[PDB]
Amino acid sequence: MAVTITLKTLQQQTFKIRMEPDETVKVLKEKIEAEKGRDAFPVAGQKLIYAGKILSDDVPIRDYRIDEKNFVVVMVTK
Amino acid sequence: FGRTGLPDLSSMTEEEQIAYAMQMSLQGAEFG
């Protein structure tokens, strides 16, 4: 019961995740982190970029109008 | 090494994901 977010994994891998636009982008960190790595994408350091607007995993992905046509770079740090 | 869809930044993560992140974070927000 959610949409298909779209992100850009620094490595150049353009893909998309299956979280809800209303979520706080953290649930997303759970997925993307599970897809890339709990070291290179640990929900903790999990953050995204939409139009230069970083998005801490504890913020709303929808707050950054993250559409499927566009993507948000998934930046993280250990 | 990690051509199987796995970067890891060989331990650069923060700087490599912040550097890489920004570079592609601007997918389109600076007329170019």
**Of residues A9, A52, A76, nearest to B26 (C-beta):** A52
φ and ψ at B24, to 5 degrees?
-100, -5
Query: Whole-angstrom distance between the N-terminal and C-terminal Cα of chain A?
Result: 31
What is the Rg, in whole angstroms, of the alpha carbon atoms belonging to chain A? 11
- Chain B contact probe: residue of A6, A13, A77, A78 with most B CBs at under 10 A: A77
For B18, the domain range is 8-26
Q: Which method was used?
A: NMR
Q: Which of A78, A48, A77 is nearest to A65 (CA)?
A: A48
Measure the CA–CA gap between A11 and A9, rounded to whole angstroms. Answer: 5
Yes or no: is domain A1-78 CATH 3.10.20.90? yes
Residue whose structure tokens are 């897809």: A35
Residue whose structure tokens are 């809800």: A20
Q: Which of A45, A58, A52, A42 is nearest to A8 (CA)?
A: A52
- Count CB atoms within 10 A of the CB of residue B14: 15
Is residue A67 classed exposed, middle or buried when 0-12, 13-18 and 19+ CB atoms within 10 A define those classes?
Answer: middle
